[PDB]
Structures are given as structure tokens and as C-alpha cells.
RNA sequence: AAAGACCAAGGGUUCCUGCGCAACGUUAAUCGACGCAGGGUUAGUCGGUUCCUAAGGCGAGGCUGAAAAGCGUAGUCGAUGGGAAACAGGUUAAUAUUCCUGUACUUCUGGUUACUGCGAUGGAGGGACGGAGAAGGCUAGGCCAGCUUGGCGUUGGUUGUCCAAGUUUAAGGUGGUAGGCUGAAAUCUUAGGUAAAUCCGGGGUUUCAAGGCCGAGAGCUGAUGACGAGUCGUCUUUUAGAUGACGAAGUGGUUGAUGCCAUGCUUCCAAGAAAAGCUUCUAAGCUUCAGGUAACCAGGAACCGUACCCCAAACCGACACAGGUGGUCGGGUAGAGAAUACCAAGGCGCUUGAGAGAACUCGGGUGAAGGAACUAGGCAAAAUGGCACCGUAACUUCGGGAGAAGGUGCGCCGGCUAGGGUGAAGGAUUUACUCCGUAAGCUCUGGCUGGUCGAAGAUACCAGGCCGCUGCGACUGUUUAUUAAAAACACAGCACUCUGCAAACACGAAAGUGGACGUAUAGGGUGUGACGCCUGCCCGGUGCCGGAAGGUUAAUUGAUGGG
């Protein structure tokens, strides 16, 4: 489902698109939609605070059910949809009581599949259960950190985590970052991989496609004047002239920035 | 209107050429009215006074003219005009 | 050639009118200053 | 395709009439957007207000902050969006979808009658929406013919296959069409819709398949009306302003929108407002009540704007300033066309003229012979230019290059000839806004030949110059508003690095907010800059990362000594 475009024009050369024909061709589920107005990555104060954000497409937010807390009641997937809010696909579960919900679609999940969450959920790659009921060695996604807070960890397209160890009240997961982390065994997770794993194979072909996604251009620091950037200045084209730093002076080649002593006990082994 | 307001609504007939032509041809009479006189208060006032039957009242506000003269820009008062149409027999 | 003044009475009111000035403390200071000088016009 | 007519913004009386000309008007002025005075703007349906919300604002308490305040919950505002309804004709010096005539529509209030479970701040539905493309169906508008009225042409001809003008008519009602969407009904039950639900959602049976929703437009009616050149009153009044009765024809064909069906359909990816009005369901309450429903009668629809200019002399530019100013309408012939030329409806000749016809300047026309010798440089100019057809190189990422290059034809009038569309007949479904089909007539596209005029037929306007080598940047894009458009910036792609979520990072004394209602295929920073082949050696310096045996080392503590 990776399609390379023919070079019928400049800007179409090097366009590689993910075209999923199994996605829903109609409208999303209206009761689960919600207004989502854009910021230009701008603050409470009206200040930017996050550069390169602006001018994408209008998007409805989809109310994705991250706390799959309808334990016991089975569901039918019955649809997989496109979500503009995330790189993963979403599936519209229809529960046995008729309630409809949106969840992150797992890898092999198609319309008509049966998903269930709870303690006694069968071990198949769409189901959700607390991490203590997940056998060691399973591949999981959408892992809670706080019981009841909802899925937080493995959520983007193709994301997954590996359950490597299980102590008393904690479970050790291997994140796709390579970090070994401790998670409460009471926290819920969904078995399997997240869908749309081929999303990384796509290539935008042109400057416009990045603008379609709401990303404004990045200007290099060496292209500026010294008043704007630490890398600015120089007659002719020059390098940074100093150890590379952010526009606010923080070194950006190495120079670890993690300063969270509160959560340090949850990190077994650290990788990024 | 349920008081002595009846006497403070109509300020007097309008004495234009358009007014007299309207009085003759149609049965409409142009009055000067208070600027806060509603169309219902004008109809009631012209019925209590003048002892006639009013068919329809239409009103318009008239901007006072400025006349920038003699050390400054003056201004005449804004005033309201009512076109009052009666039954054909009545002449007010 | 488009010039700097592009009149809009609604924008003029919302940026410089009496209620815009009375909404803040520095705006109330402008009205105090303009009353103390004796300006015939107070706001626009 | 405006230099015409409008809507908005902005302005504010500049609008019209009488009087007037000092100043204002780049001259004069009897004239005026100028002076004095008077007049002029009429709404249930237009636009506001009112209802509803977007971004955003303010924000009871609240949280935070030396103070001033900041942020924000409940709320409350905030259109550029959503939400009831009106058209034609007449009329003023100046208003008209507002006044008058005619015909409508919407929504409220009161009362009477008859029947009846009504009730939200809640549930559900609905409202309710993207880009592009297509092929239909209409309509406005255009043209032609017929008809009516008038004419018979200062000069050859013109009683005719002649000329001119007109040939109009809305909303609404009826109609449910082209066409679009969706299976419908009964019954039983139910982990859902924060509580309840008879509504919605889910589940199980039985029956029938045709029920429902939407929907341009046609026809009929509206309309015996209105309008209509003109005729007869002629008071007049010359310039023919008005003056009040009558008033002919008012029909077919074709073409046809960028308007409507259409918020439809197809397709794509970048995945496409909200809320209310509206329908429906119940909760608290209310139970002869109230309330609801339907019919009839009666009455109402308040307030504000409305003049006038609005590609402009009335707005933004100090000016009656060659600039700028959002949206709508936009006829004819030619034309692909909203280009262009000439015209229409309308509107103008741009507020100093009159001469003369020197140099020189500006903007053009033509030019002997030569043809880039000019010049820093072919700057400028000249040239090319349309359609159909033939033909077209290296190189290539296979798309291109390419309109490569280059060439042929082109007007007008006949002869023959091939097909679109529409279309009375007739036939069918002789069910009806039905289908098939149709002679003539209109209309569109061709083919083959012949003749003919001119120097010249893409005859005007309009309308690519082209080729070869090489540097730079891959490309479309962006930029020094006002001497720089580039090789600069961006860019897709690449890589390094940070970041485990109360993320890094950023703005904030803070609360909080962005990142993100995202979660390592993610987010930030840095550098490089499509693609192809690649990207070598150096860790001494500086930075960063990791380690911690040793040395040194802060506040602190205060042994000991000396007073
Ligand atoms: Mg980048
Ligand atoms: Mg850059
Ligand atoms: Mg620079
Ligand atoms: Mg610096
Ligand atoms: Mg250098
Ligand atoms: Mg009236
Ligand atoms: Mg009014
Ligand atoms: Mg104009
Ligand atoms: Mg004046
Ligand atoms: Mg005038
Ligand atoms: Mg003068
Ligand atoms: Mg005047
Ligand atoms: Mg606030
Ligand atoms: Mg307070
Ligand atoms: Mg409001
Ligand atoms: Mg609006
Ligand atoms: Mg007018
Ligand atoms: Mg609701
Ligand atoms: Mg569209
Ligand atoms: Mg003759
Ligand atoms: Mg049909
Ligand atoms: Mg007007
Ligand atoms: Mg100027
Ligand atoms: Mg002038
Ligand atoms: Mg001008
Ligand atoms: Mg413009
Ligand atoms: Mg033109
Ligand atoms: Mg020559
Ligand atoms: Mg020659
Ligand atoms: Mg030559
Ligand atoms: Mg030379
Ligand atoms: Mg020379
Ligand atoms: Mg040149
Ligand atoms: Mg030229
Ligand atoms: Mg020449
Ligand atoms: Mg060179
Ligand atoms: Mg370039
Ligand atoms: Mg410049
Ligand atoms: Mg330039
Ligand atoms: Mg570079």
C-alpha cells in the first residue's frame, strides 16, 4: 500500500503515498467528533513558544477511547478510519450494548473483528487487560502509566512495547526508544502492534505537503544575524563558529536535558 | 400612552409642499412628533385628539443640519416626522 | 498606494473608545489626564 | 467586464428647489460637491435590533502574584457564519421591494369551540458544511421568424424576399417533473445515550418489497389585470415637461450560461466550523387545572437605518491629487474568451484657452546602401506570433526536452456530398409533467471539387523569436515596503542530537499556557539541501558523553593555640 507517483510534474516526483483502501470511505462518526481550532503554536500570552506551527487543514478531533474500561462487554471493529490527529488508524468499536467508541487500531485488526477488554480477555492482538495478566514476552501498545489515566506510551503508527520482566507490583517494559521502564502491573495495555506501520515509508515530495500538515518553514541559525541567533553572523557563508546551540543558547549535540528526579526510579535502563 | 402623554406626542403639522400634496391627493398628514414617540403612541394621540380614525402611521427620523457658521460648527436638533394616513372621509 | 489609515469605526471604537479606556487602569489614567487638561473630546 | 448600474465599508447633507458669486474652483463663470434659505430619507417581509454561536474578549467565586495585577471555572459578550416571511406596476424636484394599486407570505396575541399528558438547564435526531472533476437537466439572456404600428426616402433603385420600432409581465398558488438519497412495516427484548424515556442505539423473529424524504424547472393560474408605439382630448407653450381617457400586436423556433438543480454525484487526501432555532423523548413538577393539539373569529408585528457619493471631485492619499479601495450585474458583431476591436443600455470630452509650426526634449510613423561595424552588454528597437496538418535533435530521472527546430494551407463565391441536435406528425405505456419517433423549419460539425480578386486572405486589434556551449541553484516558492529577486532564504530528502510524558523545549516572579487533547513511525533543536556515485585520515585543543581510585575544593562545624 506504498505508492510511488510518476514524474508527470516537478513536485510529483518523489511523492510516495500510503493509500489504504481498507479505510472507511465515508464520514466519521459524528457523536465522537469535536471542534479543534488551531494555534500557530501560540501561548496563553499569544506568544509562539513552539516554532514552525501554522496553516494546515481544518481537523475535527476524534474522541479516542484511551481507557478501554468497558470490561466484559465484547466489541465488533466494524470500521477502520483515517484520523488527521495521529499517525495511527482508528477503529470504531461497536459494543454489544450498541455503544460506539474509537480506539487506536491494532496492526491486523480489520472490520468485523471481535475485541474485548478485561481480566479474562483472550490473548489475541486486539485485546486490552492489566499488564499483570499479559504474559512475559508479549508485544503491547497503548500502555497506561497511572491506573485510570488511559493509554499513554505506545500510540503512534507502528508503535509497540515489549514486556520483558515482571516483579511483584511492577512490570518492566522495553520501549521502542530502547529505554527499560517500570510500569505498575495494575495498568492496562493492548496486545499487539499499532496499525499503519508503513507510515514511515511515505515521502512527501514537495514543500507544499509539509505546509498541508501545518508545519511552517525552519530557518537555519547560521542563516541569521547574530542578534537573532547564536549561530548568526559571518561574512560569506560560515559555520556556527561555536559549539552548536539552540536559539536560546542550549547545546544541541549531546547535552542531555532530562532533569526529572521524581520519576527516576521508574527508569530501569536509559536509552533514547 | 395612558396619561397626559397624549399632549406631548404631536408637536405640530408639517408645512411642506410634499405635506400639502399628500393631504390633498392621498389622505396622509405629515406631523412633527416627539423623537421618542412610537407609532402606536402617534396613532393613539391622533385618535384621541382630532377625533379621527388612523389607518396607518409611518415614521422617520430627520437629522438636524449642521450649518458651520460664525466661529464653529453648529447643529440643529434631530427631529421626527410621522406620515399619518386616515380613512378617506376624514380630513383631520 | 495603500496608506496607513484604513478607517473602521468598529475597530476605532474597540481600540480607543470610552469603554476600552475605562476597562484598564492606564486607560482610566488617560481619561484623568484628558479631563485635567480640559479636552473637549475625551475619546474616539 | 466601464469612464455604465449597484451592495458593503468610509464620509455625513455633499441630495433637490429658490436666491446668489466675495472667497473656494489652478482661467472666466450667469455654473458648481461653493454661500444663504427652505425642502427631502415612510418597511411585519430590505439591513439591523432580537435568537445562536467561531476566533477572541471579559469573567462571580477560585488559583496565582510586593501592590498594580495575571490566569481562568460557572457564565456573559463577540460575525466575517447559522436562524420567519414580498413581489410586479404606478408615482416625486428630491424616497420607495418602505408611499399608492394589485396579488402574496411569515409569525405572534386574545377569545370561542372540540379533543387531549403537558413539562427542561437534560437524552436523541436535525441543522451541518473540504478540494477537484464530470455529464446532464433547466432558466435568465441572445438571435431569427411571424405579427402589429409607422414609413415609401434631398442621389441610381426601393409596394417589397424592403426599412424602423414594439412584440412585456413578478412573487405566490397548483403541480412533485429531470434528477438525488434511503429498504419499509409489525412484534418481542435489551450491560448503552450521566436519572428517565414510549425517542435513539443494540439484539431476535415474521411479512412485503415499494414506502418515505428531497428536488431545479415545465405547464396552468396569478393576469378580463398591469404594461404597451401611439390616438383622441390640447389647456398649453416656444425645445414639446406635463395635462386624462383610450390604446394594436403581444406569438413560434433556435441558441443558451460562470446563474439554478447542487449543501447533489464521482474521486482524492491535506480528511473538511460551532451553537441555536427545529423535530422528538422523558426528569423534577403539574393532574377537574395548567399546558398541548386542531378549527373559526378578531387583532397585531415595536425600535434603529434608509437622502447622496461609493474605481470616487463626496472614502484612504495635506489637493476637485494619473495612486489604493471588498463584493455584484455585465447586451450586440467578430472572437476560445470576462483578451481585443467597434458599438448598445447608459455615461462622458477629463475647469485655462488661442495661435505659431524654431532649436531642443518627450511619445510615435517611414527610411537608400550596409546590417551589431554600436555598446561594458544587441540596452533599446526591430522581429516572432493564430489554427489545422506534416515534421522535430542531443540528452533524459522515461515524465520530458517539445510549440524543439522547420514547413504547407488559410479570403470570397459556386457544384456535389457526410453526419449532430431539436422537432407536428404518427405509433406506443393510446396509465401521463410517459416512451419511441418525426417532414418541414432552425441549429452545429465536416468532406471532395471548381471558379475568382488583390502586392498581400491568421490582412486590422490581438498574437512565442529561435538555436549551440558553459557557471550557479535541483525543481514550484520566498526576500532587502522605497536603488539588491540573486548563486541569498525556504524546500522535499538526509543525518546528528535531545525528549518516557507533569517530555524535552518556550512564554510567564507564579498560577498557568503552548508542545498536544500529541506519546519515540512522536515532538524539539542543529546542520546539509531533489536525484545519482560517494562522503577519506586526525580525539592532540575546545565542547559533549561516561567513570570515580586519587588530589584539590563552599557554606557549615569549631579541636587547638594566642590574647
Ligand atoms: Mg527540517
Ligand atoms: Mg532551513
Ligand atoms: Mg544575511
Ligand atoms: Mg549573542
Ligand atoms: Mg570564507
Ligand atoms: Mg405602512
Ligand atoms: Mg423605518
Ligand atoms: Mg462608476
Ligand atoms: Mg454643507
Ligand atoms: Mg447638487
Ligand atoms: Mg475665480
Ligand atoms: Mg449649495
Ligand atoms: Mg479572562
Ligand atoms: Mg475576582
Ligand atoms: Mg451571545
Ligand atoms: Mg453577518
Ligand atoms: Mg435616488
Ligand atoms: Mg440535546
Ligand atoms: Mg467542493
Ligand atoms: Mg431617388
Ligand atoms: Mg423522479
Ligand atoms: Mg437611495
Ligand atoms: Mg501626498
Ligand atoms: Mg481635475
Ligand atoms: Mg483621484
Ligand atoms: Mg485590490
Ligand atoms: Mg476589454
Ligand atoms: Mg535602413
Ligand atoms: Mg532596405
Ligand atoms: Mg543579414
Ligand atoms: Mg563590437
Ligand atoms: Mg567600438
Ligand atoms: Mg531587449
Ligand atoms: Mg516592438
Ligand atoms: Mg520603426
Ligand atoms: Mg567560468
Ligand atoms: Mg532557484
Ligand atoms: Mg528595495
Ligand atoms: Mg528590485
Ligand atoms: Mg546550505
From Swiss-Prot, chain A:
GO terms for molecular function: RNA binding; rRNA binding; structural constituent of ribosome; transferase activity. InterPro entries: NA-bd_OB-fold, Rib_uL2_dom2, Ribosomal_uL2, Ribosomal_uL2_bac/org-type, Ribosomal_uL2_C, Ribosomal_uL2_CS, Ribosomal_uL2_dom3, Ribosomal_uL2_RNA-bd_dom. Pfam families: Ribosomal_L2 (PF00181), Ribosomal_L2_C (PF03947). It comes from the Bacteria. NCBIfam families: rplB_bact. PANTHER family: LARGE RIBOSOMAL SUBUNIT PROTEIN UL2M, RIBOSOMAL PROTEIN L2. This is Large ribosomal subunit protein uL2. It comes from Pseudomonas aeruginosa (strain ATCC 15692 / DSM 22644 / CIP 104116 / JCM 14847 / LMG 12228 / 1C / PRS 101 / PAO1). The gene is rplB.
Curated annotation (Swiss-Prot), chain B:
Keywords: Ribonucleoprotein, Ribosomal protein, RNA-binding, rRNA-binding. The keyword Protein biosynthesis does not apply. It comes from the Bacteria. GO terms for cellular component: cytosolic large ribosomal subunit. Transmembrane segments: none annotated. SUPFAM superfamilies: Ribosomal proteins S24e, L23 and L15e. One of its GO terms (biological process) is translation. GO terms for molecular function: rRNA binding; structural constituent of ribosome. The keyword Transmembrane helix does not apply. InterPro entries: Nucleotide-bd_a/b_plait_sf, Ribosomal_uL23-like, Ribosomal_uL23/eL15/eS24_sf. Pfam families: Ribosomal_L23. One of the early assembly proteins it binds 23S rRNA. One of the proteins that surrounds the polypeptide exit tunnel on the outside of the ribosome. Forms the main docking site for trigger factor binding to the ribosome. NCBIfam families: PRK05738.1-3 (NF004359), PRK05738.2-4 (NF004363). Part of the 50S ribosomal subunit. Contacts protein L29, and trigger factor when it is bound to the ribosome. Belongs to the universal ribosomal protein uL23 family. This is Large ribosomal subunit protein uL23.
UniProtKB/Swiss-Prot annotation, chain C:
The keyword Ribonucleoprotein applies. GO terms for molecular function: structural constituent of ribosome. Residues 24-44 are annotated as: Disordered. GO terms for biological process: translation. One of its GO terms (cellular component) is ribonucleoprotein complex. It comes from the Bacteria. PANTHER family: LARGE RIBOSOMAL SUBUNIT PROTEIN BL34M, MITOCHONDRIAL RIBOSOMAL PROTEIN 34 FAMILY MEMBER. Belongs to the bacterial ribosomal protein bL34 family. This is Large ribosomal subunit protein bL34. It comes from Pseudomonas aeruginosa (strain ATCC 15692 / DSM 22644 / CIP 104116 / JCM 14847 / LMG 12228 / 1C / PRS 101 / PAO1).
